[PDB]
Design a protein around this ligand. Structure first.
Ligand SMILES: O=C(O)COc1c(Br)csc1C(=O)O
Length: 297
């Protein structure tokens, strides 16, 4: 029982210990391709790399490397692609990945600039009249519309494969108030955002895996995915007590290193899941409440 465990950890204030225990037990697989000299400029962080076994391969003979991992949650039956914020030279690769993997949604949990630094390249058009063309991957990206809320923006984009001229609508979910190595304002604002992504159908199994990223693609992104998977597990069995949050995080860490970067992000994951469980078990009204408490208007 997560709610009981939560109260127990909070009482003894031992979140740091619990979190470090997960780190100690976390899987360790090679990241040789990511460490190849030719890919040095394709990585934003020297200490954050995708494992070779779960890395996303670009469909090109030249260089198929991109700092992105496929987190395939067998039991939950849902997959996510976690990646770093695209660099000025990997935006073409980023969209190539979105196209090849047939993703319908992209979840961004960081701002382009945080604490005075550029944590992510401006990989999407900010104005309808100024579309983007990635010559290296022969793709065109156009902003179709955007719905701006107080702490998050949802954009509708049109991605076109210039080679075949095929077109696809990509939904962009941009959470703009989640601090690096931080946590959301409240479980309410986080769940409100998560359900926005869910209600878009971007997580449907008929689409490719949703792409999730922050700056490094493990802290904030890890928190997002853990919460979602836990709620999904719980939902499939309609049994909140059947989910072991720590166990699921460890499973996720088999696919990408360092998912969830601080003990508080872990603690926030519990909070989010516990609160989200209310909706899963039939309390439809809580959704309206989260929307109100989030102050998105
Ligand atoms: O997402 C997070 O909470 C932390 O991710 C980050 C990691 Br790993 C290294 S730097 C960095 C950042 O956001 O600058």
């Amino acid at each position: 029982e997560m709610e009981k465990e939560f109260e127990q950890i909070d009482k003894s204030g031992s979140w740091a210990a619990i979190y470090q225990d997960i780190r100690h037990e976390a899987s360790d697989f090679p990241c040789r391709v990511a460490k190849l000299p030719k890919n040095k400029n394709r990585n934003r962080y020297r200490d954050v790399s995708p494992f070779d076994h779960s890395r996303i391969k670009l469909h090109q003979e030249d260089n198929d490397y991109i700092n992105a991992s496929l987190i395939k949650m067998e039991e939950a039956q849902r997959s996510y692609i976690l990646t770093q914020g695209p660099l000025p030279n990997t935006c073409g690769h980023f969209w190539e990945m979105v196209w090849e993997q047939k993703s319908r949604g992209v979840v961004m949990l960081n701002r382009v600039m945080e604490k005075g630094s550029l944590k992510c390249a401006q990989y999407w058009p900010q104005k309808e009249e100024k579309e983007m063309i990635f010559e290296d991957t022969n793709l065109k990206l156009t902003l179709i519309s955007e719905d701006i809320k107080s702490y998050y923006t949802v954009r509708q984009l049109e991605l076109e494969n210039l080679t075949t001229q095929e077109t696809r609508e990509i939904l962009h979910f941009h959470y703009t108030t989640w601090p690096d190595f931080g946590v959301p304002e409240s479980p309410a604002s986080f769940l409100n955002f998560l359900f926005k992504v869910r209600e878009s159908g971007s997580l449907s199994p008929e689409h490719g895996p949703v792409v999730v990223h922050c700056s490094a693609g493990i802290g904030r992104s890890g928190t997002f995915c853990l919460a979602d998977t836990c709620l999904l597990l719980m939902d499939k069995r309609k049994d909140p007590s059947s989910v072991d949050i720590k166990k699921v995080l460890l499973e996720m860490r088999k696919f990408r290193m360092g998912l969830i970067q601080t003990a508080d992000q872990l603690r926030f994951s519990y909070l989010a899941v516990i609160e989200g469980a209310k909706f899963i078990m039939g309390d439809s009204s809580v959704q309206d409440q989260w929307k109100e408490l989030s102050h998105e208007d």
